[PDB]
Amino acid sequence: TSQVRQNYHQDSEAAINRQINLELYASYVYLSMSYYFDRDDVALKNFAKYFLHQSHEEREHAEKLMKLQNQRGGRIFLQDIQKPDEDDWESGLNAMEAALHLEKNVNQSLLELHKLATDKNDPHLADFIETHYLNEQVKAIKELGDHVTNLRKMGAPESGLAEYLFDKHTLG
Amino acid sequence: TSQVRQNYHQDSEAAINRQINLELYASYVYLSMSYYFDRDDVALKNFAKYFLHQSHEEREHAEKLMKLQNQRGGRIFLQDIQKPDEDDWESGLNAMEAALHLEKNVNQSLLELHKLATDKNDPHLADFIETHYLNEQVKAIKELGDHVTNLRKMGAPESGLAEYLFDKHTLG
Amino acid sequence: TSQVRQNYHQDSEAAINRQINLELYASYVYLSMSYYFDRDDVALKNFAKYFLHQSHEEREHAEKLMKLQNQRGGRIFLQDIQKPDEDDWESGLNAMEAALHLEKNVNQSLLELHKLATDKNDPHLADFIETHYLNEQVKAIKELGDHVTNLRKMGAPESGLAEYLFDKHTLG
Amino acid sequence: TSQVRQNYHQDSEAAINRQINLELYASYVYLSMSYYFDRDDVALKNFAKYFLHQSHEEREHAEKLMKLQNQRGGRIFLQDIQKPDEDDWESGLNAMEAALHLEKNVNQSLLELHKLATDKNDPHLADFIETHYLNEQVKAIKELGDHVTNLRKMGAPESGLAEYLFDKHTLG
Amino acid sequence: TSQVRQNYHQDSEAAINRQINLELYASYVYLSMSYYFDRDDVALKNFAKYFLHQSHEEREHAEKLMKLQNQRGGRIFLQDIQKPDEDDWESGLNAMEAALHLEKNVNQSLLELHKLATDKNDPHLADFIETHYLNEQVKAIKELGDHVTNLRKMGAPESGLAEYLFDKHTLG
Amino acid sequence: TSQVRQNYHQDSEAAINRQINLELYASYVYLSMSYYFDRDDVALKNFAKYFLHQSHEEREHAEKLMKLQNQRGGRIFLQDIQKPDEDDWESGLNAMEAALHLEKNVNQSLLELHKLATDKNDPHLADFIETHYLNEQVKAIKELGDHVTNLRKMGAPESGLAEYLFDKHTLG
Ligand SMILES: [Ca+2]
Ligand SMILES: [Ca+2]
Ligand SMILES: [Ca+2]
Ligand SMILES: [Ca+2]
Ligand SMILES: [Ca+2]
Ligand SMILES: [Ca+2]
Ligand SMILES: [Ca+2]
Ligand SMILES: [Ca+2]
Ligand SMILES: [Ca+2]
Ligand SMILES: [Ca+2]
Ligand SMILES: [Ca+2]
Ligand SMILES: [Ca+2]
Ligand SMILES: [Ca+2]
Ligand SMILES: [Ca+2]
Ligand SMILES: [Ca+2]
Ligand SMILES: [Ca+2]
Numbered sequence A, B, C, D, E, F: 001t002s003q004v005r006q007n008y009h010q011d012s013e014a015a016i017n018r019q020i021n022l023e024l025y026a027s028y029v030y031l032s033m034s035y036y037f038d039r040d041d042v043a044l045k046n047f048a049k050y051f052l053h054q055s056h057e058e059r060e061h062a063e064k065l066m067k068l069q070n071q072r073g074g075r076i077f078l079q080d081i082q083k084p085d086e087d088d089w090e091s092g093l094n095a096m097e098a099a100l101h102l103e104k105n106v107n108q109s110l111l112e113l114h115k116l117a118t119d120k121n122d123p124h125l126a127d128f129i130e131t132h133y134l135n136e137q138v139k140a141i142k143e144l145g146d147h148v149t150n151l152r153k154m155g156a157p158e159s160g161l162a163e164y165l166f167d168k169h170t171l172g
């Protein structure tokens, strides 16, 4: 056992490894979305920038969980990063809806992790998840919902003018 | 159901609406206290400023709960803001004692809200309440207790000289 | 009688208490409107900011009337702040129309207050109302009318694109 | 009962007094270690500085718990600060190992305190401990483990050259 | 066919998709190496920082190839990012040797890509690879070889003092 | 015998260890006094700050004696730090009187130490004590006497107004 390990359950260690993979997966989904908007036949530069920023932030989220694993004396076991479920994200609205779904899935996983930490009487882990992950997820979900609403109200996806103007005025 | 809503119980949503009202009520109590000290026959300008500041801070507290409700996909339902239980707050000491009582009541409500969040396995809400409300309440209660103690020790309310000097040296 | 009171009729004192309540009510209506636009299914951030600013300004208006009451040696008697007449404000256009109606009601009350002051030969009160309230109300009403006109001309509320663009270009 | 006391169990108050003593004890252990490295026959100035810094930080930790006790309306009861379990700390490596053991003991106590707070439905106390103590302890333990590992890998304690170079390059 | 596509062979498009995956794979290998050095039982902070920097640079390399694919009117098809071939990288020297091997494999792939571009008379692609990838690879390989040589000459891995000092003086 | 030791009697070494303990004890007494004034039912913030400053200065005094012991080639032997003789310090005046008594006791010990140094023909130790301790003690005693006098003349402890005003105007 690691000399630093204290009050850190095997199940929590495993759940953190799973969460690392999920954050890396989210980073990869956002990378895919970004470059879809960089296609010459899509050509929404601020959608591309928005999703690239999200991709880089998800990598930061994963790295912080890797740091946590080592802080607690767990051992990192990486797994493959699955490719995303689409190659073509169809539209700005559709990508935002897929991102909303992704973020809710990530949130669900984090909530299960918090419950595990609580069940194993690991208050350090529970508060790590609260403090660094749970409000970030609520903010991310709220932002994506706001974006979806605006795009729908403006007439996306059928209105390419709507997506163009949203790209300029919200994402610019 | 709101597209953002996740792990947010109906009971929690209702409790947040009640808490919004209570913070707005506290803002109104402090507004009343402030202008009592602005009366020509009371004339304690720093008591007036202290309570006006508290009034504005309570409004900020309410607004942050309104933001939370929307972040979580709940729906804000406002209720009347009841007028305070006094029109004439009698003295600096008496107002400070009433403020202490108010803050303990607000704290009790927040503790019940945290317990509800915990019971509904809503760690985001529990940590929102911890992080933004519970230590602020402990600090507020401690400050008011300190003020009450000083005013009592100095001879308030019968000593108008005591209230005058406290106004200058503590609240100035 | 207060040592400062001079030329200040009982009826004027009562009317000022009523006006304090009306300004606090207007503040609360605007607070409600603000957070309606913060909902994830409405999501017009600059409408939200506009109405929050109006809410805070109405509180300032109320506080100045409280100060006036004490300046003149009247006594403040607060009343409940009624909740607004809607929970759901429907659209940007509908909220602007409701705000226009509110401001005209507040203006009507202020005009009646000025008439009372004049009838009681209270030129200080009449000029307080002129100087600090009446042109502010005319400006507020004109602005809201301008906003209503633009939203109607642009195609609101059926055009969510109209409300989106107004939010960006007028209220941003 | 103190006028500020609310939701603060007798057992929690007692546990906070015990924790104050433990933090003061840790401060004293680190003070002892510091001046061991200041001996002419040990002469590792950066080990001395490192442990003196830790001593001063532990005093800050104790003072913050004293402040907490008063914030909550508990009453501070101090106890003797026991002298450390060694006078001669043998080597840089041995002192780091003893510090690691100390910090794990302090952590164990803090975890028991959090569990108590949770059991007594004291979310303010639980989050005080989370926010100000638990991650600090995880960081402290990780740092000490890292230091122990490096010293072992370098050849300490038999290599006085190892301890010398660690003093310069890690602790300098 | 994309409106921008000109002189861009199907085989080149496919090879660029493969290269994107390989750069993302290299990023993941370096991420794994980084956090191995962050373990409490390894504890070489500058090895950790070095490899994290390499990880982030490999992501940049992948993103630039994604941009290229779109510039030329090809279509990005992402694939899974395979987990690395080790979980435990054993030592600073062993990780540097594995990184050298990785970089030579990436170089081999880039050289094959250049040959393909040349064979398909695609001078834009050939010079993209020359200009942005081939000298970077030669520099990376030379640096890693230099690091391997130094660690071997110093006595790594058996000398943990060697790895410690290399971490401080070369990688710091 | 330590390689640095010269003209340093065993009895002097022992007396320095005793003095270290006494300075640490004084630090602890002042810490206790400080947080007594931080109680909600005492609430004299500048008394609290004054005594906390004294606590930190006494720790500095102890650390300098530890440094001296090592400078001379003596060996530090720490002892328990006894808890203070009161938990409740009663009033500002009573705490100042207890501090005066403490400082006179510390002075008596330092004078005995100087006499010992003189008797053992240790002029370095005698002048260390003169230069760094004896005038500091005379200044401390004079200040505390001045404070006691003022509090008595003002009407402390029965006048809580006296203690309040002293806290503001002398200790602020
Ligand atoms: Ca464990
Ligand atoms: Ca386990
Ligand atoms: Ca595992
Ligand atoms: Ca796959
Ligand atoms: Ca698929
Ligand atoms: Ca599919
Ligand atoms: Ca499909
Ligand atoms: Ca927030
Ligand atoms: Ca739900
Ligand atoms: Ca429900
Ligand atoms: Ca409700
Ligand atoms: Ca009422
Ligand atoms: Ca009543
Ligand atoms: Ca009544
Ligand atoms: Ca009554
Ligand atoms: Ca928390």
Ligand SMILES: [Ca+2]
Pocket (backbone or CB within 6 Å): B135, B139
């Ligand atoms: Ca605090």
Ligand SMILES: [Ca+2]
Pocket (backbone or CB within 6 Å): C005, C006, C007, C008, C009
């Ligand atoms: Ca009159």
Ligand SMILES: [Ca+2]
Pocket (backbone or CB within 6 Å): C008, C009, C010, C011
């Ligand atoms: Ca009249």
Ligand SMILES: [Ca+2]
Pocket (backbone or CB within 6 Å): C013, C014, C015, C017, C077
């Ligand atoms: Ca009236």
Ligand SMILES: [Ca+2]
Pocket (backbone or CB within 6 Å): B080, C082, C083
């Ligand atoms: Ca009503």
Ligand SMILES: [Ca+2]
Pocket (backbone or CB within 6 Å): C084, C085, C086
């Ligand atoms: Ca109604």
Ligand SMILES: [Ca+2]
Pocket (backbone or CB within 6 Å): C085, C086
């Ligand atoms: Ca209705």
Ligand SMILES: [Ca+2]
Pocket (backbone or CB within 6 Å): none
């Ligand atoms: Ca209706």
Ligand SMILES: [Ca+2]
Pocket (backbone or CB within 6 Å): C135, C139
């Ligand atoms: Ca004008």
Ligand SMILES: [Ca+2]
Pocket (backbone or CB within 6 Å): D005, D006, D007, D008, D009
């Ligand atoms: Ca209690």
Ligand SMILES: [Ca+2]
Pocket (backbone or CB within 6 Å): D008, D009, D010, D011
């Ligand atoms: Ca109890």
Ligand SMILES: [Ca+2]
Pocket (backbone or CB within 6 Å): D013, D014, D015, D017, D077
């Ligand atoms: Ca106790």
Ligand SMILES: [Ca+2]
Pocket (backbone or CB within 6 Å): D082, D083, F080
């Ligand atoms: Ca002992």
Ligand SMILES: [Ca+2]
Pocket (backbone or CB within 6 Å): D084, D085, D086
């Ligand atoms: Ca012993």
Ligand SMILES: [Ca+2]
Pocket (backbone or CB within 6 Å): D085, D086
């Ligand atoms: Ca022993």
Ligand SMILES: [Ca+2]
Pocket (backbone or CB within 6 Å): none
């Ligand atoms: Ca022994």
